[PDB]
Design a protein around this ligand. Structure first.
Ligand SMILES: NC(=O)c1ccc[n+]([C@@H]2O[C@H](COP(=O)([O-])OP(=O)(O)OC[C@H]3O[C@@H](n4cnc5c(N)ncnc54)[C@H](O)[C@@H]3O)[C@@H](O)[C@H]2O)c1
Ligand SMILES: NC(=O)c1ccc[n+]([C@@H]2O[C@H](COP(=O)([O-])OP(=O)(O)OC[C@H]3O[C@@H](n4cnc5c(N)ncnc54)[C@H](O)[C@@H]3O)[C@@H](O)[C@H]2O)c1
Ligand SMILES: NC(=O)c1ccc[n+]([C@@H]2O[C@H](COP(=O)([O-])OP(=O)(O)OC[C@H]3O[C@@H](n4cnc5c(N)ncnc54)[C@H](O)[C@@H]3O)[C@@H](O)[C@H]2O)c1
Ligand SMILES: NC(=O)c1ccc[n+]([C@@H]2O[C@H](COP(=O)([O-])OP(=O)(O)OC[C@H]3O[C@@H](n4cnc5c(N)ncnc54)[C@H](O)[C@@H]3O)[C@@H](O)[C@H]2O)c1
Ligand SMILES: [Cl-]
Lengths: 334, 334, 334, 333
C-alpha cells in the first residue's frame, strides 16, 4: 500500500534522493533506476561519494539489480524514453532527474510509457505546477500529473521571502547566490553553448551566471511577482551554496525583529524547512544539512529601518534531495 | 630629485609594488627592503610567483642586496621598527605593507626613525588621511605625513560609486565582495582570534567576512555617508575579487545609460582607474589587470529604473599594487 | 588506575585526538587543553571541522572549561612551558602536538613542569624512542619518559614494509608520498625559511618536499637500514595522502601473492592497522578512515617478479590521531 | 608554405594555433573543425584561464577567425566523410578531437583528401609514433598517419634516453603526478573506462593508468619491457611531474646524472630538456615550452645504481609546442 517510484537519471540528485529515501526508512519503494551506464558503475557511484561519504556498505550489484538485503532495485539503461516499461512496473511517480527533459512535452513521454505522475527535479518550461515545501506545496492538486520542485536556490530564497513577506512585506528584492560548482561545468576551459562563461575552468574561476530563482519565487509567492531579480557566482567549492538577499521591506523594522521572525518561523511554520543559527558558520558546516534555508544571523547587515542584506545557506545537493522525498511523501498522502 | 622609498613588508603587496615600479620604469628609487627573512629567500619570492608568473630572470642576491643590473636594493631584517635606519638612507616615503602597523601610533614610529612620510597599504585606524586614486586623491595635502591607500575593495567600489553619484545620485547601496583568499587565511582549520570564520580552511569553504569598504567609501565620498553597507565572502581562488553592488539611484535611468556612463568615465575622468567591458569574462581573465574597477556590463541586472545590481572586478594584488605606485608618483609631483 | 593526559597544541592532531578518545569511549581522561587562544574559540574549532564534519553538538564552553555532559576539560593558554601546571594536574602523559617541541630537550620541559611522560606527535630529535603501532610498539620500555609516534607517512609505510620484509624480503625501496596540504603551508606565496618550496601557494601547486619516513622505517625495522629512500609531493587536497612504494623484493613472487600477504596481515597480525581493498577508491573515500595504511590492490603495478610499485592510502589526520590513542592505551597497560 | 587544419579545437587544438602564431611559423592553418560555432571557439582561443589572454585583435567574422590579414575558415562537421579536405589543399590534418585515435578512424581524413594525419595522442594500430629529440629523425616521408605520443611520454622519453646513452637502464618504474584534464568531472559522475576518473577532479587524488612507460619502449627499443608506470591525477589545472625510479646498468653518482642531463640540455637535447636547480613548484612551469625539465634538487639516490628522478612538464604548452616542432620538421623532410 506504498508509493512506487522510479528514478530517471542516477546523478548527484538521483543518487542522493535514493540515499535520503533509505536514510529515513521511507515507505516509498524505488522500483527501477534508469541511466546511461551499467548498474555496476551506478552502484559504485551510489556507495562512494566524494562529498557525502560512503553509504550502504552491504549494497551490491547482482543480476542487473541493486541488492540491499532483500530490497532489489532494477537497473535500466534506456535512452529512447518511449522504451521505458513504466506500465509493467506499475509506476506511480517518475522522478525525472536527467536534466534533459525539463520541457513539459518531454516529461509527458513518461506518462505515455505508463507512469501515473512525473516529478521534474528542476525548473520546467511550460504549464508545469511548481512547488516549494513550506511555501506553496499545499496547493498541490491530485489532478496535477507533471509537477516540479523548483531549483535548490528557489527552495532557499522562497522560505525566507515568505517570512519577510508575512511579517514585514517586501517592496523590492535583489538576490545573489554564491553557488557551488555543478556537473554542467568543466574541469578545464571548454565550450558551453548556452553560457560561454560556464565552460571556463570551474575550480580556477569565480564565474558569473544567470538564475531564475528570483522570478520563480514570484510564482509560488504571487505577491512577489515583479519584485525580485538576481544573479549568481559559481565558485570553486564542490557543494553548499549561499543566498545574498538585498531587500527593501514595506514596514520599518530592526534586524533583531527579522532574526526573531525567522527564529520563530524555524520553530513553527517553517519547522524542518528553515533553520536559524547565530554560529560562525562556513559553507562546509552545511555539508549534509537537510534544511532548505539556513538563516545566518551574524552575517547579515542592516542599512536602515527598511533596507537589509540577509544571508541564507543551503546544501544544494542534500537539502534539495530531501525536499524531493518530502514532496513525494506529500503527494502520496494526497 | 627622484623619490627614495623603502618597502616595509615584502609580501604579496610589497613584492608586486617593486614589480610594478620596474615594469613601468618609474623614476621612484627603492632604497631598502625590510622583512622577516633573509634577502636570498626574498629574492626567490620576487623572481617566482605562483599567480603572476616569473619576473626579472637576471635578478640575483649578492652582498645583502637585490642586484638587477646596476640597481642594488639593500635588504633588512629588523622587526623592532626603532632600529630601522631611514634617517641614514634619506627615506622619503615608507611603504608600510607588513599589515601590522595599521594604527597611526604604530606607523608614526617610522617617522621617528628618520622617514619623512609613511604610506600604509591598508585601511588605517586613527587620524590618517585615506585616498583613492580617481576619487579623492587630489585632496592630498603636503602636510599629511601619514597617509593610507584604503583597501583593494574600497578602490574597486569607490570609482563606481562616484560615477553613479555624479550621474544619477545614490539613495542606498548594499555591497558584497566575493573575495579571493589572502595571506591572513589558513590552509586547514585553525584559530583566528579576531575572525573565527577566517581561520577555517581557505580552499574548502565559502567564508563570510566583514568589510570596511562601505564605510570607507563614505569618507572619500562624503555625500554617501550613511548610505552604504557591505559584507564579504572569501572563496577558494588565489587572486582576483569582484564587487556586487546593489544600489538604488536617486533618479530614474536605464541599465544601458548606466553602462554608457561607466564606459565614458573609463575613457575620461576614470582613465586608467576604471575599465568597461562587455565580454564574457571570468575572474582569471583579470590576473595581471592593473585597473581598480572593471565594470562587467553583461553580468549586471536591473530590477526597475532605479534599482540595479552592478558587477565590478579587480585584481586585489596587481590592481592595488599599481595604485600604490600611482599614489607615490602623485605625492612626488606635489 | 586510568590515565590522565593533557593535550599541548589543540590543532588538527590535538583536536582529532580528543575526538578519537571520545568516539571510542576510551578510559583516558583528558585533564587540560593548552593552546594559544581562549577556550571559546578552541571549543568552536573542536565542534566544527571543515574536513571531518561537526562533532559533539551538546559540547559547551563554560567557566574556562570544555563541558561535555559530566566531562569537564580545563582550558589553558600558556606558551612558556615552564609555567604549565602539570604537577598540580597530576599529569601522566603530555600529548605534545604543537609542532614546536620536537627536540627532546624541549619536550623534557614538560617533565620539569610535573608531567611523568611526553608523547611527541611527530618525528623527534634526540634520544627519543619512536614507535609505530603494529611494527615495533611492543619495544616500549616503561623507563621511556619521552616517546614519539613517528610521522603519518612512517605509520603508512612501516606496516606495509614489515609485511613485505617478513614474506619476501626487501633489497631496495624508493618511496614517494603524494601528501595533502598541512598547517605549515601557505594560502598564498610566502616565506618559509626551512623549506622555500613549502611557502608557495598550497592550492596552486604540486610542491616537492623531502621526507624522513624512509629513514624512520629503517629504525623501527633495522633489517631495512640503508635500503629505503624517499621524497614527497604536496598537492591541493585538504586531507588524505597516499604512499607510492617502488620496491625490489629479495625473492621472486607475484602481485597476487603480495595482495594475499597484505590481505592476510590485515585479518591477523596487522588487524586494525592495515586494510586491504580492491575497490576503485579515490582519496576522499578515506576521509575519516582510522587505519594507518590501506593497500590499494588494483592501483599497483608489477614490472617483473621482483620489482613492484605498490599503493597505500592513509588519512593523515584521523589515522594518526587514532594511533596516538592506541599508543596511549598500550602505554597505560604496560 | 605548409597547409594544415585543426580537427578538435580543444585545449591542444587552440594552444597549437597559439604556438604557431607566437613563433610566426610559416605553417598556414587553413580550416578549424569542432562541435561549436566559431564565435564561441574564437572566445575560447582569446581567453584562457591557465595561459592568459591572447590575440586581442582577433575576431570572428564571416564564419572565419580573422587576425589582421590571416583568415581561418571555421567548420562544424562531425561526420568526417563530410569534411572538404579534397577541396582544400590540406597537407596535414592535426587530429586533436581525442575520438579518432584508431588508425581506421584517422584514415578517414585521408579519404576526404588529406595528404597526412597527425594524431595528437597515443594511437592504436600500426601508427608510427615520434618523440622530438628521441626518435623523430626516424620519420619516413611515406608515413601518412603519425603520432606525437602523449605529454607524459614526451617528458619520460628524453630523460630515459640520456640515462640510456650514459649509464644504461636495467629497470624503471614511473609515476606521473598529473594535472586534471578535460576527461575528468567537476563532481562525481560516471566514467565507463576508468571509474575513478569520474570522481570529483578537485576533491581527490585519483589513481590512473598510463601507457607512457610502454610507449618509451617503442621510440627507444632498448627499453622494451624494462619500464612500467602509473599516474595520480591531482587538483591542479595544468603542469605535471614524472617520478622515475630507475636501476641503472653501471655504477654512478647523482652528480654524474645531473651533469649528464645538464650536458644534454645544452647540446643534443637543446630546447627539449631543461636542467634546473631552483626551488621550483608546478606553477613555475605554466607556459614553459620544454618537454622535460629535470628537477636536480628534488631527486634522491639510494645507492650507486638505484635513483629516483624528477622531471616537470607543462602538459598543455609543452605538448602543443612539440606538435608545431614535429610539423615544421615534417615540412622540411
Ligand atoms: N546538482 C544540484 O545541486 C542540483 C540542485 C537542484 C536541482 N538540480 C537539478 O537536478 C537535475 C539533475 O542534476 P544532477 O546534479 O544530478 O546532474 P548529474 O549530471 O549528476 O545527473 C544526471 C544523470 O542523468 C544521466 N542521464 C543523462 N542523460 C540521460 C538519459 N537520456 N536518460 C537517462 N539518464 C540520463 C547521467 O548519466 C547522470 O548520471 C538537473 O535538472 C539539475 O538542474 C540539481
Ligand atoms: N593581498 C591583497 O590582495 C591586498 C589588497 C589590498 C591591500 N592589502 C594589504 O596589504 C598589506 C600586506 O598584505 P599582503 O597581502 O602583502 O600580506 P603578506 O603576508 O603576503 O605580506 C606581509 C609581509 O610582511 C612581512 N612582515 C611581517 N612582519 C614584519 C615585520 N615586523 N617587519 C617587516 N616585515 C614583516 C611578512 O614576512 C610578509 O612577507 C596588508 O595590510 C593587507 O591588508 C592586501
Ligand atoms: N596534520 C597532519 O596530518 C599530521 C599528521 C601526523 C603528524 N602530525 C604532527 O602533529 C603536530 C601538530 O600538527 P597539526 O597538523 O596539528 O598542526 P596545527 O597547526 O593544526 O596544530 C598546532 C596547534 O598548536 C598551537 N600552538 C602553537 N604554538 C603553541 C604553544 N607554544 N603552546 C601551545 N599551543 C601552541 C597552535 O595554535 C595550533 O592550534 C606536528 O608536529 C605535525 O608534524 C601532523
Ligand atoms: N590535455 C592535455 O594535457 C593533453 C596532453 C597530451 C595529449 N593530449 C591529447 O590531445 C587530444 C585533445 O585533448 P584536449 O585536452 O584538447 O581535450 P578537449 O576536450 O579540450 O578537446 C577536444 C575538442 O574536440 C571537439 N570535438 C569533439 N568531437 C568532435 C568531432 N566529432 N569533430 C570535431 N571536433 C570534435 C570538442 O568540442 C573539443 O573542443 C586528446 O587525444 C588528448 O589525449 C592532451
Ligand atoms: Cl580510576
Amino acid at each position: 500500500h506504498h508509493m512506487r517510484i522510479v528514478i530517471n537519471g542516477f546523478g548527484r540528485i538521483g543518487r542522493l534522493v535514493l540515499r535520503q529515501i533509505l536514510k529515513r526508512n521511507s515507505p516509498i519503494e524505488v522500483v527501477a533506476i534508469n541511466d546511461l551506464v551499467a548498474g555496476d558503475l551506478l552502484t559504485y557511484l551510489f556507495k562512494y561519494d566524494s562529498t557525502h561519504g560512503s553509504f550502504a556498505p552491504q549494497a551490491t550489484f547482482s543480476d542487473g539489480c541493486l541488492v540491499m538485503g532483500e530490497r532489489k532495485i532494477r537497473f535500466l539503461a534506456e535512452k529512447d524514453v518511449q522504451k521505458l516499461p513504466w506500465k509493467d512496473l506499475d509506476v506511480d511517480v517518475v522522478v525525472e532527474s536527467t536534466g534533459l527533459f525539463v520541457n513539459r512535452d518531454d516529461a509527458a513521454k513518461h506518462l505515455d510509457s505508463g507512469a501515473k505522475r512525473v516529478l521534474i527535479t528542476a525548473p520546467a518550461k511550460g504549464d508545469v505546477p511548481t512547488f516549494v515545501m513550506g511555501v506553496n506545496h499545499q496547493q498541490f492538486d491530485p489532478a496535477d500529473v507533471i509537477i516540479s520542485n523548483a531549483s535548490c536556490t528557489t527552495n532557499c530564497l522562497a522560505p525566507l521571502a515568505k517570512v519577510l513577506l508575512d511579517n514585514f512585506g517586501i517592496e523590492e528584492g535583489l538576490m545573489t547566490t554564491v553557488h557551488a560548482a555543478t556537473a554542467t561545468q568543466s574541469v578545464v576551459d571548454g565550450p558551453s553553448r548556452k553560457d560561454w562563461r560556464g565552460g571556463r575552468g570551474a575550480f580556477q574561476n569565480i564565474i558569473p551566471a544567470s538564475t531564475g530563482a528570483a522570478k520563480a519565487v514570484g510564482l509560488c509567492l504571487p505577491e512577489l511577482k515583479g519584485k525580485l531579480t538576481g544573479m549568481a557566482f559559481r565558485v570553486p567549492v564542490a557543494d553548499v551554496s549561499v543566498v545574498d538577499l538585498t531587500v527593501k521591506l514595506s514596514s520599518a523594522t530592526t534586524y533583531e525583529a527579522i532574526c526573531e521572525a525567522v527564529k520563530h518561523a524555524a520553530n513553527t511554520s517553517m519547522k524542518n524547512i528553515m533553520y536559524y543559527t547565530e554560529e560562525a558558520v562556513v559553507s562546509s558546516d552545511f555539508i549534509g544539512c537537510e534544511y532548505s534555508s539556513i538563516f545566518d544571523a551574524q552575517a547579515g547587515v542592516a542599512l536602515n529601518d527598511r533596507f537589509f542584506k540577509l544571508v541564507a545557506w543551503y546544501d544544494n545537493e542534500i537539502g534539495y534531495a530531501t525536499r524531493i522525498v518530502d514532496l513525494l511523501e506529500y503527494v502520496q498522502e494526497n
